[PDB]
Swiss-Prot record, chain B:
Taxonomy of the source species: Eukaryota, Metazoa, Chordata, Craniata, Vertebrata
Protein name per the record: Glutamate receptor 2
Family per record: Belongs to the glutamate-gated ion channel (TC 1.A.10.1) family. GRIA2 subfamily.
Comment field on protein domains: The M4 transmembrane segment mediates tetramerization and is required for cell surface expression.
Miscellaneous note of the record: The postsynaptic actions of L-glutamate are mediated by a variety of receptors that are named according to their selective agonists. This receptor binds AMPA (quisqualate) > L-glutamate > kainate.
Induction: Down-regulated in the pyramidal cell layer of CA1 in the hippocampus by global ischemia.
Domain of life the protein comes from: Eukaryota
Annotated site (Crucial to convey clamshell closure to channel opening): I118
Localization per record: Cell membrane; Postsynaptic cell membrane; Postsynaptic density membrane
Post-translational modification: Palmitoylated. Depalmitoylated upon L-glutamate stimulation. Ubiquitinated by RNF167, leading to its degradation.
Length: 260, 258
């Protein structure tokens, strides 16, 4: 049987090829998660079809209806066999689906326009001349909203009350705001995306300081799925063989536009 | 029934307190994994006893007898219920015990005596005047044994054929060998331990180069153990609450003695 893989279009994980109209099936797509899916399938011995999650979401449980959306929902309700995507291992997701050990690490990080005089979260928190914010929804805003840590609590109070709004609707809007604000806006986002954008023309942004937290992306399967064991062993093997490091270097740096 | 926790004396994870003979039970010990054990037990609602691994090893399988030693062995053969320790999640271990998602990241790294003219693994691999090795019965030695990455493969061939032996039985032995060999021994050990030691007296060692790999430590249980689910959920909760980061900052805090 062909294994149904649910994933999401986000660069550089999964992208439609420029010439996709001339291609078929899995060959329409490229990226880190496309390469990872092929390696997993080869090690586990299965054929697969890449499908893009209908609602474009990662996975959260609606407060009112209690229905899981996104890739997580596709697994929970039995519509897909596996999710191969930048999907973070979190407590509430682990309660409803199985996860491999993580294939990539990340944490919340600061993006500045080059030249901005900020080196750390502590620096941002202690000032207001350089405004700073997050996506208007999702996991990074939630991190600050929920934090009991003093520095991050202070940052949340500032962001929630800052005018005009320091929040943005999309990643692209956050990046454009950093680039157009003459050093007066810093954007808080996942370190993996920050690193990727640091390698996009016009090469005017950079990641600064240590990460604010630590977490990992994992491959997800329905709870109790037999496929989960083999997939987890494959991730651990690909890590030890150095293949995951090779794939991150390929998509972030070999294909990067801003030099070393 | 009281849960039997196996762990290992390795700074700053588990250390015997200076006045331990005046203390009783779990209070004899301090460190990151001692604090983590307390937190896991509280979230999971069990009572527990910290016990130090009988043979002083992390855990590997004998290639001839196929018997596991160290903390891994204590779980496999039923001598302990759980390991709370800097125990690295690896493929060969995952096949025989259960692991939580990782509670801490690390990578293999190089420790030298100050002044040693080595800056990278590639530098080590290209010479023999400065000997280099690692710990027996752990994940670092297994990593070199199995690696086909050119530089690491060459390092393993060197280590296997070096005379006298470049391997050590405990982390403490490896560190003492660096300190006493006048620049002629380098030690391959995890970045977490390397960085803790660099910040403390006698201030005569240092970490050089980037890490060779990236991996994590996990809480381990016998395969199929019912305690596994709850412990894994507690690790994720403690991560999300910021508690793991709090413990890391506490135990790796730089007092500035170096
Ligand atoms: N943490 C390692 C021990 C140290 C090492 O081998 O470098 C293990 O679980 O075996
Ligand atoms: Cl750059």
């Amino acid at each position: 049987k062909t294994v149904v893989v649910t994933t999401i279009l986000e660069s550089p994980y999964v992208m439609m090829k420029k010439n996709h109209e001339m291609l078929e099936g899995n060959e329409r797509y490229e990226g880190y998660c496309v390469d990872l899916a092929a390696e997993i399938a080869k090690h586990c011995g299965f054929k697969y079809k890449l499908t893009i999650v209908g609602d474009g979401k990662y996975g959260a449980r609606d407060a009112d209806t209690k229905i899981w959306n996104g890739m997580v929902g596709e697994l929970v309700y039995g519509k897909a066999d596996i999710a191969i995507a930048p999907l973070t291992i979190t407590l509430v997701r682990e309660e409803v689906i199985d996860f491999s050990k993580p294939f990539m690490s990340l944490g919340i990080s600061i993006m500045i326009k080059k030249g901005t005089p900020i080196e750390s979260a502590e620096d941002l928190s202690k000032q207001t001349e350089i405004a700073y914010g997050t996506l208007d929804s999702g996991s990074t805003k939630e991190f600050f909203r929920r934090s009991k840590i003093a520095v991050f609590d202070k940052m949340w109070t500032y962001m929630r009350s800052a005018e005009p709004s320091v929040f943005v609707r999309t990643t692209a809007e956050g990046v454009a705001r950093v680039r157009k604000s003459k050093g007066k806006y810093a954007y808080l986002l996942e370190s993996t995306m920050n690193e990727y954008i640091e390698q996009r023309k016009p090469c005017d942004t950079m990641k600064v300081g240590g990460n604010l937290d630590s977490k990992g992306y994992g491959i997800a399967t329905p709870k109790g799925s037999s496929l989960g064991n083999a997939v987890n062993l494959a991730v651990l093997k690909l890590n030890e063989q150095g293949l995951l490091d090779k794939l991150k270097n390929k998509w972030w740096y070999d294909k990067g536009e801003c030099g070393s």
